[PDB]
C-alpha cells in the first residue's frame, strides 16, 4: 500500500483469502469490514501517527466509532484483487470522517463504497467532549481541503435517523460472547465482531437467497470482554431489517442497525 | 506465492495485518493456523486440485484432519513478512501429512514450524477409510518421495499420545458456539476455531505472563453450525502445560482433545 500522489489519501491492494469467503466463494461483509480497518490502519501509519495525535496523548484522548456504513455492488470472489482507497475529512468540532472506495483491480471498476463517522473520547472516563482547535489543525494537513465523499448524494442512506427496535423481535440469537480472537491488541472488542453480532440473528434462509447490499451501523456503547449479548433483528420491508444488539443482562442498548438485502 | 523450482514444495509471503495480533502487537495462534491453511489451499490450487484428487470425487471421498502440532519460536509483529513453505508427504494407507516452515522473511531464520496428519473420510456416511492405490498413485507425483519432515527428531512431540481429561477441570469456559464467521465455504466449523475454543479456558493471567510454545491437538468429531461446546482444561506441570477436551455441552460427546506448553516471557 501507498499515499497516493497529492499525500491526501491511500491505497492498498488485498487478495482475498480462503478462509475470508462465505458459501458464495466471496468475501464476507465481515472480512470486507476487516480490510477497511487495514487499510484505515496503513494509512494513519504512512502519516506519522503511531490513530492519536501528539495532542490527544497529552489529554488521553481517543478516537471512537459513532458510525459505520457500508454497501457492496460486488462482493469480491476467492483468489481475486481488491483495491481500496481510503481519505479522512474534518467535519468542524463534531469529529472526523474515514471514507473508502472499493474496486475491481482487474477492471477498475466500482464494487463498494464506505463511510464512518468518529466521535473524541477521554479513554479514561468514557467521556464524548468535541474536537479541540490544536487536534484540528494537525489533522487538516493529511485530509483533502475541499470535501470529498463517498457518499456524495444530498439526502442520502449513510445519515439516515436509526429508530430502536421495540420487543417482541422477530429474530433473536442471544447468548453472544466475545472471544479472545474478537479482542483487539488494546484487549476491547474489535469494531468488526459487532457488525457480525447484528448478521447472527438474520435467518439462514435470507442469507442462503439474499445478498447483503447496504449495512448501517450506529455505536451506543462498547460491549466488554466479559459482556453477553442479545442479538435483535424484525423486517421492516429488496428485503429491509432493523436490528439492535443489547446486554442479555439488564437489556442495555450496544448498537442499532439496519440491512437491506437484494434477491440472488 | 509460488511452487518452488522442483514443484516439489509451495512457498508464500504473508505481511502481518492490524486485527491479526493480540496484546503483544504480534500475530495470535489463530492467525498462524489462518497461514497455514491458505498457503496449504494455494498450493493444492497450484498443482491443479480444487484437496480432492480426480478419483476422490467419483467416490465421494475428502480429505479430513486427525491431528494438528504448530511449535513457535517467535511470534511475527504487526507489519512483518513471514515466509511459509508448505509440503505433502503420503503416509502409506493410513493417510497423508501436510508440514510447514515458517521463517522471518528479512532474516531468514526459522520461527515456527508445523505438522499435520489427514485421513479420508465419505463426505456423506462421515465413515473413515484407508487410502486406495489410485488415490496414492495420484497424488504422489505432487510429493517428495524421499522423507521430509518439519519434526524430523526421533522423540519428537507431535507424535505423542494424548490422554482424556478427568472431571473435575481445574479451569473451564462453557456455551462456547459458532457464529457464521467461524464457518467455511462448505458451511462446516472451520478447523482454527476449535484451536480458539481450546484456548478460551486459558486463565488470562497465563496468557499475560507466557507465550503459547506448543500445540497439539486431536480432532475426534466435527462440530456442527448449531452445536454448543465446553473448553476444558488443567494443568499438568518456567514452563507450563495444560491438558484440553473440547466436548459438547449437553451429552458431553467428545469433539477435541489437546496439550499445550507455554513459556515465561
Ligand atoms: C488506526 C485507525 C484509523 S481508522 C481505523 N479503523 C477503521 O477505520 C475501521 C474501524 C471499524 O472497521 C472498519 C474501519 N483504525
Ligand atoms: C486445499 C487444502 C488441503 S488441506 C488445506 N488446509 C490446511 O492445510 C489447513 C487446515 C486447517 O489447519 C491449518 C492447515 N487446504
Known sequence: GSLTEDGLSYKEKFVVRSYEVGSNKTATVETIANLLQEVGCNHAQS???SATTTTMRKLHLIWVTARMHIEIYKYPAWGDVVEIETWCQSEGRIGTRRDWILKDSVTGEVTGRATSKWVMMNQDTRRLQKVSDDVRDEYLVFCPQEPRLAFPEENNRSL???????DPAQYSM????????????????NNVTYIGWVLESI???????????VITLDY???????????????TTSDSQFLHLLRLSGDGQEINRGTTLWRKK
Open 203 to 213: 435467518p439462514q434462509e435470507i442469507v442462503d437467497t439474499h445478498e447483503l447490499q
Open 174 to 189: 442471544i447468548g453472544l460472547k466475545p472471544r479472545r480472537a474478537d479482542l483487539d491488541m488494546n484487549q476491547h472488542v
Open 47 to 49: 502519516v506519522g501517527f
Open 220 to 234: 451506543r456503547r462498547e460491549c466488554q470482554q466479559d459482556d453477553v449479548v442479545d442479538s435483535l433483528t424484525t
Open 160 to 166: 439516515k435517523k436509526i429508530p430502536k427496535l421495540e
